[model samples]
Target: MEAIPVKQFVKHIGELYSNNQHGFSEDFEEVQRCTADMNITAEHSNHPENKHKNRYINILAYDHSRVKLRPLPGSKHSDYINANYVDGYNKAKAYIATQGPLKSTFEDFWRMIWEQNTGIIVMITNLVEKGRRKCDQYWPTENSEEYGNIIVTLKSTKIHACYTVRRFSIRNTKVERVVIQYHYTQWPDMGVPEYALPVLTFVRRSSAARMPETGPVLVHCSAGVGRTGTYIVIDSMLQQIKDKSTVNVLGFLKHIRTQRNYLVQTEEQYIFIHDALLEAILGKETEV
Candidate 1:
């Protein structure tokens, strides 16, 4: 991919960011201003934490890519734990929410799910959050047509899918699975994180093969920005690897970057993708 000038990048981003974008003629003046105001020397974009064990971003990026993430409309301002923060769901058919604070909106979303006959409100998260979640709980029962949510624990990282639904969760309309993954960038041990990131595709496939209603897979970590982006990048790279294709790693990243700037956040984090995933997939040199 050729590097474009900053002005061009700003213009391109403006066109990409606004509502009714993609030639739908939305005004992008604010987007243009925001893009132009970007200072490379700023803190988040400058140092952009790369070596931390965990990181979080305040804002979520919603790229207009097909099958890309869709936000609850007008939810760009509310803090995650807020009641009004999810106003965008009023316009949606359903939501793909994390297992955390998503019940109220999810109730509205679940109604649309059944109306559309959508399958699988796939919920994936580490088990730690299950109890902490006040809403969207109670999705684990078989014949759970009550329209709560589907909770699939990625039992450890290996038997995540089967163990989560091993007992009584098949007949429900929403199909789901879970998997714990070893995120390599979080550590310096340099081997592989406990669970391979490929487990995302693993869980996705397992859900689809078992049920016809497997709907969109919604994912998130603490901030739902940093690791979420990493997950997508790794998932995309796994597809490339499976196809035996060769392309610049940066090129691969632009997919996320174009959709989400906070994606890969810093150049260091961008470099980590090469080191962490390559080591696990090939056991080769771990150069960033």
Candidate 2:
């Protein structure tokens, strides 16, 4: 990764953005092409009259090689969450990307986390956005709360300029898991952050935090697509660049879509990735 000069890498990124068509429609085209070749079945999301889960998403882990969970008994319907394992750089089944928990699917959300043994949860959206409740308030702010059999206690918190780090001890009858929730507050719904440094730094620090290798890092946005996709793209691409000294942005986005449908939701979010990675490698400090 260190074989190439940092300046050349930044310049290459700048050149990618310099082209108009590649900067705008390239990833969209690539994802469309690659997904056409994928044969994964999405029967869960395709069922008619199923309102618990979103109509467009599916869990890729169901047919793949990692953790997969059956329906938990809490929601009106058995389906309704949009969490799936996403492959990162060289790491297999790196993280779980999903939609924010709906009010009815809160228990199911916790069950998924507990059953999956997730370590760090990268929540990219707030409870509300633009007069709409994007996600349900699944965690307690002050005291402990229970969603079904799961008990979540707010062990501690540290507020940062752009994000808040919360420690929670989640326990269910026989076992307990201490989970770290890194809530990023600045990113608007369907919008980008003010700059890329803070987010890059947050990813750096969160990835550095001690967590079980058996556990996957949990990531989510409102629909589990746009902002969620953007973060993972940067995180994965940055790591790929670090480990292999090269990156294929469009190919990476296409590869991520194989894990979850409709990832990197928009062309704008796709472009922000290029912007963020260049700035990240240019020695942009991600401190706090």
Candidate 3:
């Protein structure tokens, strides 16, 4: 599809995956300009008509297949997380949103998405700073504190590939499960099929151990597109198979589109998900 017009920005859904083109075009730039003086609208994301549905939320600014998603820095948020929605429902109690490209620092972005509202973070590890004394260097609020948040370190570009989430442990007690973020970005496959562990680890825990009757686990990556889409699709396919749900490619596509506006952004990613689901159901692959 051609780039959406400047006036149509209000209707521009953050549709990820599927067969939609994405970017910061003049229309989006105009939309951003319009919203610069106002609050970020959660309308399309939290519409009343969208209650009680599974979704795959995302942006389409990155490659769709190579799931190389880097986590943002920090761990706090007040701007994006609003109290109520204009749509009238409780707004999205649980969700996954992208944070990077540095409008805010990575550390700050990390802080923004870490909350009871967030189930898990499916991110990519940036090992580019490994052993270089640069991971946390000048990274705000610190004289360099070694953070245990680091889980899997494969190469020099990606430091770790996991971000465990257990928000209700010390709070009002809404959840009883735990999930680990599986970060992608390494090796020959752009770290996809290889880093599937972290995503699966988080999903199994979130699906089996946790109760998201109220909300679903969060999934994202840098720009929250490629890897985010892949992870979300894989996890959903697992859920569908488990529930004996019909295996329709459009059904899977719609599922991802509901939560993640921009997911699985390529022909290859679509084929990857399609074949992956078939392999998963046929028992061809023990673990996808």
Q: Return the top candidate by TM-score.
A: 2
TM-score of each: 0.43, 0.85, 0.45
Clashes of each: 10, 2, 32
Candidate 1: give its CA RMSD in angstroms.
13.8
Model 3 residue 157 CA deviation in Å: 18
Q: After superposition, which runs of candidate 3 have C-alpha atoms over 4 Å from their true positions?
A: 1-78, 81-95, 100-114, 124-179, 185-216, 258-260, 284-288
Candidate 1 lDDT: 0.35
**lDDT (Cα, tens digit) per residue for candidate 2, span 166-235:** 9999999644778999988876655677688888878888777736565788888777877888888888
Ten-residue stretch with the least lDDT total in model 3: 81-90
How many residue pairs clash in model 3?
32
lDDT of 3 by residue, 1-288 (tens): 122222232122233222443432332333223324334344423433322111223332112211122333461221232111101012232335442324223423333333334444444434332332111211222122212332222111223445433222111222122333444444232434533444455555544543445333444444455555665556655664554433334444443343334455555555455445444444433322
What would the per-residue lDDT of candidate 1 be over residues 248-277, giving only the tens digit for each residue?
A: 344444433443335444433443454444
Greater lDDT among 1 and 2 belongs to 2
lDDT of 1 at 147: 42
Error of 3 at 60 (Å): 7.5
Ten-residue stretch with the least lDDT total in model 1: 82-91
- What is residue 68's positional error in candidate 1, in angstroms? 12
- Candidate 1 lDDT for residue 186: 31
